[PDB]
Amino acid sequence: DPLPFFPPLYLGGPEITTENCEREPIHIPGSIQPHGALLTADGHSGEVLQMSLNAATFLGQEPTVLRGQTLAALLPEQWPALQAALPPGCPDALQYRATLDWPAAGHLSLTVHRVGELLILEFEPTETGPHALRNAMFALESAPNLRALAEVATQTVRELTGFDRVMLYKFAPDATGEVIAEARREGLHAFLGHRFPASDIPAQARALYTRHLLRLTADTRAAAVPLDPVLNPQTNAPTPLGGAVLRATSPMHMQYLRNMGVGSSLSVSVVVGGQLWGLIACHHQTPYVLPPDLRTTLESLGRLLSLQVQVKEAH
Amino acid sequence: DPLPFFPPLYLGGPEITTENCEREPIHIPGSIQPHGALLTADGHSGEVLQMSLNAATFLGQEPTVLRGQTLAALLPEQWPALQAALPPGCPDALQYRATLDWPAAGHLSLTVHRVGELLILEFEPTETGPHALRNAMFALESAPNLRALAEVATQTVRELTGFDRVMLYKFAPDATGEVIAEARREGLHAFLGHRFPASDIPAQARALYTRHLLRLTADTRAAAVPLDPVLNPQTNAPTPLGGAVLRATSPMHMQYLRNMGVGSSLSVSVVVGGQLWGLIACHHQTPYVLPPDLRTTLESLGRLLSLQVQVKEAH
Numbered sequence: 001d002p003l004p005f006f007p008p009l010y011l012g013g014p015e016i017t018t019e020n021c022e023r024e025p026i027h028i029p030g031s032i033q034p035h036g037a038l039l040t041a042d043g044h045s046g047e048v049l050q051m052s053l054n055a056a057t058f059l060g061q062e063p064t065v066l067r068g069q070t071l072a073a074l075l076p077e078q079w080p081a082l083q084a085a086l087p088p089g090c091p092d093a094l095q096y097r098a099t100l101d102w103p104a105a106g107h108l109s110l111t112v113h114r115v116g117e118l119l120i121l122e123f124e125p126t127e128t129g130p131h132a133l134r135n136a137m138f139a140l141e142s143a144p145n146l147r148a149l150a151e152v153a154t155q156t157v158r159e160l161t162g163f164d165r166v167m168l169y170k171f172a173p174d175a176t177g178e179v180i181a182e183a184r185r186e187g188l189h190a191f192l193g194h195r196f197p198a199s200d201i202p203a204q205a206r207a208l209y210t211r212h213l214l215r216l217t218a219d220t221r222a223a224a225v226p227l228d229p230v231l232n233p234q235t236n237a238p239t240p241l242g243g244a245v246l247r248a249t250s251p252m253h254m255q256y257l258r259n260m261g262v263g264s265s266l267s268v269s270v271v272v273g274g275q276l277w278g279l280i281a282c283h284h285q286t287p288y289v290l291p292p293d294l295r296t297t298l299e300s301l302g303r304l305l306s307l308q309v310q311v312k313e314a315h
Numbered sequence: 316d317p318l319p320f321f322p323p324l325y326l327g328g329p330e331i332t333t334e335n336c337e338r339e340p341i342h343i344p345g346s347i348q349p350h351g352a353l354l355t356a357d358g359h360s361g362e363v364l365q366m367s368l369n370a371a372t373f374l375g376q377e378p379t380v381l382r383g384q385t386l387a388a389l390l391p392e393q394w395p396a397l398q399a400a401l402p403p404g405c406p407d408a409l410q411y412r413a414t415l416d417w418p419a420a421g422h423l424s425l426t427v428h429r430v431g432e433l434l435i436l437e438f439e440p441t442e443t444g445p446h447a448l449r450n451a452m453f454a455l456e457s458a459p460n461l462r463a464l465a466e467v468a469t470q471t472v473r474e475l476t477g478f479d480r481v482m483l484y485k486f487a488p489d490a491t492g493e494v495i496a497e498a499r500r501e502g503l504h505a506f507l508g509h510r511f512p513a514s515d516i517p518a519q520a521r522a523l524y525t526r527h528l529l530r531l532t533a534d535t536r537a538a539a540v541p542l543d544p545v546l547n548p549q550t551n552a553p554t555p556l557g558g559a560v561l562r563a564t565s566p567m568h569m570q571y572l573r574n575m576g577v578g579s580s581l582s583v584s585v586v587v588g589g590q591l592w593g594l595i596a597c598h599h600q601t602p603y604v605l606p607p608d609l610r611t612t613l614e615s616l617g618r619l620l621s622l623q624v625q626v627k628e629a630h
């Protein structure tokens with residue numbers, strides 16, 4: 001049952017410390033991670049309303065010029081499809097995805113979702129079949145018990161991602177946590193069996209993670225890129241970014257990651273009967289962008305795992 | 316607890332009638348559906364041991380010339396990967412998949428699996444993201460009860476496939492079945508709520524379907540193409556084809572499909588606690604080849620559904 005948040009810093013909210021961190025408004029940082037670009041658009045007219053400041057790097061056109069243009073003009077091939085895929089009032093975790101062409105090598109990956117009357121569009125460069133998830137299910141299904149399932153799950157996720165460390169972190173009723181399974185690079189010190197206080201993942205983080213099942217920090221040293229304008233014109237209120245993987249990570253968590261010597265981090269919620277049961281928590285020693293298709297796979301695996309857990313705890 | 320099978324027809328087995336059909340050796344027809352090609356190879360040397368008679372249509376080289384050649388020479392880029400993916404003694408439902416180039420438009424899709432010391436390779440022409448499965452999970456999860464889940468499942472599968480009819484067929488303890496949910500093209504007569512005798516899916520079919528979760532008939536009027544030679548040289552016994560979607564369908568079932576006015580059929584097992592709970596059973600009015608990537612998606616959905624069923628029946 002999380003505290004209400006304070007205003008974001010850009011609305012004159014207070015600085016975040018270890019005394020008030022459960023009130024950080026992490027879903028509305030007004031900025032993104034610099035390895036992709038983000039636009040927002042009117043969900044009906046398709047008019048481009050906000051743009052990350054770096055958008056020219058990715059889209060090949062100056063942020064000041066793209067604004068106010070409609071998606072029907074900017075994405076003539078994707079706009080109808082995107083409209084149909086994300087109707088008014090659809091779930092905010094529902095996504096449309098397309099891979100577009102661009103002047104730089106490979107493609108751009110486009111991910112879109114809807115919050116209220118706003119569409120949120122994420123672009124990231126890209127260079128995974130249903131088969132990888134399909135093949136994985138077998139060992140997860142054969143695991144004789146919960147601990148075995150967790151061991152299979154982390155090993156499988158490590159094999160699919162290449163991440164230096166993959167943990168299954170399970171929450172206790174006091175919201176403390178414990179590393180119950182771990183697959184890691186040889187010689188990396190074990191976190192297996194270690195317990196952490198509830199404060200390491202504060203209540204508003206756990207609440208968010210029950211709604212939007214995947215979040216990441218691709219470079220624990222990269223500075224965020226502002227959304228311009230920062231508020232949504234539709235509303236003159238902050239833009240909700242919990243549904244965007246590009247969302248800027250809490251600086252408090254960035255520092256936490258750096259203190260651990262973590263270069264890149266990613267986790268997937270394990271949600272059992274609508275409650276946050278735990279996290280598949282992943283680390284890389286250096287910055288790393290997991291491709292969109294792989295993240296999507298990991299999301300589905302998180303759901304598969306949730307159900308298998310729920311099956312075994314009911315045994 | 317199925318009867319032992321008779322020899323296949325090509326070993327002088329008897330003709331199959333309505334009196335002896337539970338003894339049809341459906342897993343070893345010695346032939347494939349003509350919309351793809353099949354080779355078998357030695358699991359260690361990679362030597363090509365059997366070939367469907369149509370293989371030149373697909374592979375661009377005469378069946379008599381490809382035989383005895385090794386996969387290390389025929390597929391130099393895929394052979395190492397395929398070896399690594401399918402080690403000796405791996406599950407027979409485990410698959411390797413690659414998309415190859417060929418002189419005819421689009422690509423060839425390659426699917427491989429291992430049975431004992433034999434590798435079975437399937438080639439089919441091809442022109443689906445993890446996103447489709449990912450997006451579907453939401454409505455399946457929100458369904459308040461079992462009947463609602465089944466209704467969501469058939470509608471989702473219909474939307475993903477375009478099939479004229481998608482049913483959820485649930486088995487009773489006497490092995491009779493019932494159509495408990497159905498999504499169908501407007502004006503197609505309903506099978507919803509109809510019951511069928513156990514004999515419609517005989518015991519050796521149900522046994523197979525517990526092991527290999529997807530099978531299909533792409534053209535209920537297409538004649539099968541022999542494997543040449545018909546027996547596996549490794550063993551001078553029939554080649555097990557239950558793990559191959561190209562496997563020729565039982566002629567008894569082909570006639571059953573034609574009597575229903577079905578042009579194309581496909582089903583996915585729903586397996587709950589190791590038992591065959593039921594089938595997502597799909598029909599098209601005309602012949603239709605569901606792409607490999609879509610079949611794989613449907614397989615994963617079958618597993619997702621199995622777990623959700625198992626969750627709700629334990630409620």
Ligand SMILES: *C/C=C1/C(=C/c2[nH]c(/C=C3[NH+]=C(/C=C4\NC(=O)C(C=C)=C4C)C(C)=C\3CCC(=O)O)c(CCC(=O)O)c2C)NC(=O)[C@H]1C
Binds near residue numbers: 019024253281
């Ligand atoms: C005063 C508040 C602080 C708090 C902030 C905070 N932490 C997160 C998110 C995460 N914290 C995690 C902690 C774990 N990672 C580990 O490796 C281990 C143990 C080995 C633990 C206990 C994790 C996994 C997350 C999820 C995100 C991720 O996987 O990287 C947030 C939310 C960040 C965001 O989503 O923007 C916040 C605000 N952490 C505290 O230590 C105090 C200082």
Ligand SMILES: *C/C=C1/C(=C/c2[nH]c(/C=C3[NH+]=C(/C=C4\NC(=O)C(C=C)=C4C)C(C)=C\3CCC(=O)O)c(CCC(=O)O)c2C)NC(=O)[C@H]1C
Binds near residue numbers: 336
């Ligand atoms: C004397 C034996 C016969 C028997 C043979 C048989 N049937 C199958 C496989 C299937 N039969 C199915 C029947 C249903 N499809 C439906 O649409 C309905 C009701 C609307 C029913 C009851 C189904 C679904 C299958 C699975 C395959 C598929 O989805 O197409 C086999 C095995 C075929 C194979 O895998 O090679 C066999 C040997 N059917 C009988 O009627 C008697 C005549």
